Amino acid sequence: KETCAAKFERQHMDSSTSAASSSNYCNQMMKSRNLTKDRCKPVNTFVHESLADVQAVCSQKNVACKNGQTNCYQSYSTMSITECRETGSSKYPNCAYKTTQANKHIIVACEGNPYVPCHFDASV
């Protein structure tokens, strides 16, 4: 139903906005991007940069992934991101999230040819 690359865009990109638009941003985006369809995905990051600027990271600093493979890349500088984390009270099917705006490096796992982001590993 989706390539890794398209899934990454749906789960992690929001180039339209420079930052989260309200404290309810994560509630709205986790629902609209289909991340609460089957379960409340507990953690998710959105990146407020252009697709070209995030794709560029696959040519930046190579680092180990959390799974121990080494197809991860850390951006040389920091990016506007919004981190979403499900609240302690959230229960499917009324999934609820805290929204945190931040400016941090991103680490992404890259795959394919063209070699592009497919997983969001971490922010730092």
Side-chain angles (χ1 to χ4, degrees):
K1 58 180 186 176
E2 206 166 21
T3 67
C4 67
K7 176 169 183 178
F8 179 94
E9 290 173 18
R10 172 172 57 88
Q11 298 195 114
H12 302 296
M13 290 295 307
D14 186 8
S15 311
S16 72
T17 54
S18 290
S21 46
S22 74
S23 70
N24 240 52
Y25 175 88
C26 286
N27 285 329
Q28 293 162 184
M29 291 285 293
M30 298 295 285
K31 177 165 191 295
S32 68
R33 298 299 186 82
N34 226 4
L35 304 171
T36 62
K37 185 170 82 182
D38 293 315
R39 62 186 206 109
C40 303
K41 180 179 185 186
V43 296
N44 191 67
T45 298
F46 294 101
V47 184
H48 302 287
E49 304 288 352
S50 72
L51 182 65
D53 284 354
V54 177
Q55 291 174 334
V57 176
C58 295
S59 67
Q60 305 176 16
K61 183 65 177 170
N62 186 221
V63 295
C65 304
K66 283 169 185 189
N67 74 3
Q69 287 302 130
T70 65
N71 61 315
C72 279
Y73 293 81
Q74 179 169 324
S75 63
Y76 295 130
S77 194
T78 62
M79 289 193 178
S80 174
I81 66 174
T82 301
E83 301 178 287
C84 302
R85 178 155 302 235
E86 183 175 21
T87 73
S89 69
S90 174
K91 296 182 178 56
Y92 182 95
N94 299 282
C95 301
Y97 289 92
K98 173 85 173 58
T99 297
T100 297
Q101 180 52 45
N103 200 290
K104 288 179 183 184
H105 305 270
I106 62 169
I107 302 181
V108 294
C110 298
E111 300 180 23
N113 179 17
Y115 196 53
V116 293
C118 293
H119 304 287
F120 190 96
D121 186 274
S123 60
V124 172

